[PDB]
Write a protein that binds this ligand. Sequence first.
Ligand SMILES: OC[C@H]1O[C@@H](O[C@H]2[C@H](O)[C@@H](O)[C@H](O)O[C@@H]2CO)[C@H](O)[C@@H](O)[C@@H]1O
Ligand SMILES: [Ca+2]
Ligand SMILES: [Ca+2]
Length: 109
Amino acid sequence: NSITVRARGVNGQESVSLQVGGTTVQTWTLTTAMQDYTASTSLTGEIRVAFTNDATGRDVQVDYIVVNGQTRQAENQSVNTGVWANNQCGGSGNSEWLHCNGYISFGNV
Ligand SMILES: OC[C@H]1O[C@@H](O[C@H]2[C@H](O)[C@@H](O)[C@H](O)O[C@@H]2CO)[C@H](O)[C@@H](O)[C@@H]1O
Ligand SMILES: [Ca+2]
Ligand SMILES: [Ca+2]
């Protein structure tokens, strides 16, 4: 499988991990502009994009991923454990943003 993540940080120090079934497939440091990050995997389970180094000044915006050619918008995903919403991390779904450490789930490969 081929997976492309389109994402940015706000300050350029942010780290994200592409995970499949809980296995980290690849980690990247983001820049302050949307860019594409691509990895391959034989794994087939639940895809997550996780922000792992939250700190002052650091937040992640994930536009979408592409899975074997299918674009899956971050904001179309019901599960986002990092968005700051309703005064808490993970207070709602359907967001591009990871403010807190947490992940967006994009369903199975
Ligand atoms: O401190 C909890 C959490 O805050 C996040 O920023 C929030 C902020 O707390 C809130 O006052 C403001 O209006 O919303 C922002 C998010 O947009 C911060 O991004 C997290 O790193 C931090 O854990
Ligand atoms: Ca989007
Ligand atoms: Ca933050």
